[PDB]
From a paper:
The 14-3-3 proteins, including all isoforms, belong to a single family with structural similarity and are thought to function as homo- or heterodimers. In potato, the nonepsilon 14-3-3 protein St14 interacts with the potato homolog of FT protein, StSP6A, and bZIP transcription factor StFDL1 and regulates potato tuber formation.
The crystal structure of the St14f free form was determined at 2.5 Å. Three chains (A, B, and C) are contained in the asymmetric unit, i.e., two conformations of dimers (AA and BC) exist in the crystal. The St14f dimer has a common characteristic cup-like shape with a disordered C-terminal region of approximately 20 amino acids, similar to other 14-3-3 proteins. Superposing three chains (A, B, and C) of St14f in the asymmetric unit, we found that the conformation of N-terminal helices A-G was very similar. In contrast, the conformations of the C-terminal helices H and I showed significant differences. In addition, helices H and I of all three chains show high B-factors, particularly helix I, suggesting conformational flexibility. The chain B structure of St14f shows the best R and Q values, suggesting that the chain B structure (free form) of St14f is close to the solution structure. In the St14f crystal, the solvent content of ~ 69% is larger than the typical value of 43%25,26, and thus, the contribution of the crystal packing seems smaller than the typical case. The average B-factor of all helices A to G was 61 Å2, whereas the average B-factors of helices H and I were 73 and 98 Å2, respectively, suggesting that helices H and I are more flexible than other helices.
Author numbering:
A (entry chain A), B (entry chain A): 1 to 233
Write the structure that this text describes.
Amino acid sequence: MAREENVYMAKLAEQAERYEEMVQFMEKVSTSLGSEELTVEERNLLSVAYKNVIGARRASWRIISSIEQKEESRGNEEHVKCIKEYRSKIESELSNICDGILKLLDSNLIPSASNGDSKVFYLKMKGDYHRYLAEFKTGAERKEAAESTLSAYKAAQDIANTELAPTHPIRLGLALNFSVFYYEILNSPDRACNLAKQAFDEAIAELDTLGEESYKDSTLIMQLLRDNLTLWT
Amino acid sequence: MAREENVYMAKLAEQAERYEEMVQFMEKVSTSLGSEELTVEERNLLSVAYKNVIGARRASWRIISSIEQKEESRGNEEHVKCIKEYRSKIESELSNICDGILKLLDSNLIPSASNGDSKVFYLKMKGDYHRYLAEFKTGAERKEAAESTLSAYKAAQDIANTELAPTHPIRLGLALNFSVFYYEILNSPDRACNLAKQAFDEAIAELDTLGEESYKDSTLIMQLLRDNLTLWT
């Protein structure tokens, strides 16, 4: 049967801003496939869905962490005990969300990507979500997450380097996250700045062969890489 | 024991924008009382909580209804069947949210309000939430909701008229919702415009006895009543 229906429901879920439902709908598109790949449209929806569901918990996690620290500085110890419990609950959510998208990548989407844009897309996403585990996980789970990120970003760059134009927003967007993760989580500015400037230089080397729709895609990203290189200096 | 804790958790829930949790926390404050009333702070949190939880479903309901109608006009009948199912689900949520706050008003907060500001506050809220049932319920449930609203708004105005200054933001805010409900749901512009201009005129009759904190409260509302009277003409 046709489940353009679940795709149509996911676009309604998006319009309604009911993102948890958007995820369940795109998870139903993905776990119903035999040999078929998600279209671009479909993989983009799955990604908008997870990005909005994880975004909201990341933002809760950041305000709850600021409060946790302001109250720790003031010696308000009953508050801290309460904030910690709340942070713990949000961490539980964050960790199950990451596990849901990782499980779908590891066992449906990555093993069935054929084109290279697809392989880079799913391997980047896998990295993106291990990076999110790494922002809050602790101990050995933080270490396994930082390594899973690096190794997914690397396997993605290997394929992006050969099989995708230097100007492709997947390859540029992979460069942006990879460069930021080297700097912010591995504390390696040399590397961060390097593959940033590499991704930028390479992509102006062929910027003189895009459309008026192809441009707005990768120009947005190219400018993000640029303001970081000047920032990072 | 002290459950300033649940109040503190509700303020964390608000900061995190986890409003469903804010509701559960303020519901726990309210269902734990013996003879005690919610403070102003507490009744305001309960209200911020329910307002954000119902706001998000009302907004989903409005975009899903616009889509439902655009697709009905274009003859896209598979879409409509899908949109209707989605609208139905959002209606289920809206109806259980309204029932939760109504159950807490009808059986904890209204029967124990002592001061009059408190009685007007809970009776207004009861009206506010029956008004929301009336926006989407259908048939006899819509009729029982429109009447429950009217009768809660009336019982509230009876008390606001004697026991609260004409300038009190509860009494003015009650006037705003009451006036809007007469116009938009009962289709009675004469009445809408009347008790709007009455609430405004009466409140400038004593506007020359407020603070610099008391003012910003009821001026915001007084200007809302004013732009409607000119609009409604």
